[PDB]
């Protein structure tokens with residue numbers, strides 16, 4: 001139980017133990033808080049995030065408490081910002097699906113992963129929040145194989161400046177619904193499109209979306225009604241959900257409440 | 271057979287509009303036949319979009335801007351509303367071509383070829399102390415043999431701002447326009463250079479929107495803080511370096527089109 005009164009904490013309360021990896025806009029560490037609590041710490045790169053803007057958003061994030069969302073524990077306000085969360089022992093779902101243990105998960109387990117993520121996104125949907133960067137790399141997996149959504153809303157507070165431009169694409173074209181690419185219209189419905197791509201990621205154990213296709217080829221193909229074909233070992237029930245998520249009109253995409261209910265039914269059937 | 275060089279102001283009756291090519295904000299464009307034998311394009315301006323006297327004054331400058339990489343301005347019709355008669359370009363706009371089945375398959379050397387052709391045309395405009403004012407892939411035309419020609423050069427200056435054109439939305443697009451042109455109406459050959467950089471990104475991405483995922487306010491504030499579009503997939507560093515030169519904050523620090531044309535010509539043969 002993280003101490004409820006510990007929100008803005010000093011940097012010295014954290015002992016960074018092990019570097020888990022380096023991303024575009026920050027690094028993540030396994031750490032010990034106050035000599036006793038194992039946590040994860042995301043240290044943002046200098047210039048990636050404003051303290052005032054992040055804190056204003058992080059005070060919304062921290063209220064998004066749900067079993068399928070990574071728990072946001074604390075922050076460090078000194079530059080550059082630290083984000084302190086629960087530690088997830090099996091890392092990202094993308095890495096897990098491409099590991100020895102995760103590549104062997106049977107189809108019912110894959111459906112269960114998808115249903116867990118859908119339940120978390122249904123919570124975000126009910127709370128009138130938006131993830132903005134849903135993909136398997138932003139799903140974390142616990143020691144007992146519970147999937148939790150990470151980085152919810154974080155893309156909104158990563159600044160676009162000379163420092164972050166050096167790091168490349170902020171959002172990946174292949175996961176992003178057409179209207180957010182073309183019009184910056186990020187909504188829960190653009191999250192629904194991304195969830196469809198994530199579902200394909202899960203069923204393919206982490207294959208790149210649209211294999212063999214460049215980003216321009218993906219955009220133009222989607223405009224002509226192309227959608228990723230159903231791959232091997234993908235049940236039609238699962239593929240049909242993906243196709244619903246990839247409707248061209250955002251308003252015609254299903255709710256996450258609908259998605260979770262259908263995924264839950266297909267889990268028990270499998 | 272080439273256009274006759276004393277047929278400038280022509281009667282509307284000399285034109286047979288054959289097929290509408292598309293409807294724009296301030297006018298429409300038609301494939302037409304002139305005098306029963308000459309295939310042309312006709313841009314018919316919407317009523318209220320242009321003054322006949324102001325247009326004629328500018329059109330008499332535009333018609334002297336004759337160059338292989340600029341669309342040839344043949345004739346005009348002065349009765350309201352104005353018609354602009356030019357050569358016909360069989361593959362339409364470069365933006366549409368890059369998003370078509372055939373144009374989406376153009377190899378990288380061809381994309382560099384297109385860039386160098388446009389740069390050659392802009393170097394001519396630069397040498398003639400003219401200003402395009404609305405350079406983007408939508409305003410480049412492509413011929414049957416894949417020659418790229420610059421269209422609408424100078425036309426934005428004679429589109430009126432009134433109750434009629436205000437209903438058509440934004441006159442110039444924010445994400446294509448140099449900051450000093452947005453902020454102070456400072457349209458120069460150097461703001462064209464900025465726009466050419468955005469056009470070069472359009473070409474290498476086969477027509478993607480500039481600044482994907484970003485609103486217009488987000489683009490303006492990001493640029494003020496040194497953000498520039500990152501190098502995309504399958505964009506050589508040579509080409510991206512030219513874009514970055516075009517996007518210098520200070521206009522006088524942007525290269526000339528004579529420089530851009532020479533560097534793109536070098537990179538073309540290398541590819």
Ligand SMILES: CN1CCN([C@H]2CC[C@H](n3cc(-c4ccc(Oc5ccccc5)cc4)c4c(N)ncnc43)CC2)CC1
Pocket residue numbers: 020021022028040041042061070071072083084085086087088089091092095140149150151152154
């Ligand atoms: C080749 N791989 C190497 C490992 N790389 C990544 C390294 C960091 C890993 N990682 C990332 C996280 C992690 C930590 C904090 C965080 O911040 C927010 C959370 C919610 C809302 C807003 C912000 C988001 C994510 C993580 C973790 N908590 N517990 C355990 N591991 C974690 C996820 C994998 C991925 C590529």
Ligand SMILES: CN1CCN([C@H]2CC[C@H](n3cc(-c4ccc(Oc5ccccc5)cc4)c4c(N)ncnc43)CC2)CC1
Pocket residue numbers: 291292293299311312313332341342343354355356357358359360362363366411420421422423425
């Ligand atoms: C979805 N698409 C549908 C097609 N839309 C456009 C429709 C009009 C097309 N189009 C436009 C032109 C065209 C014609 C006249 C003209 O006027 C000036 C030229 C130079 C200087 C000043 C004025 C400018 C451009 C065109 C063409 N010449 N020959 C062949 N096609 C042409 C270019 C594409 C673009 C959007």
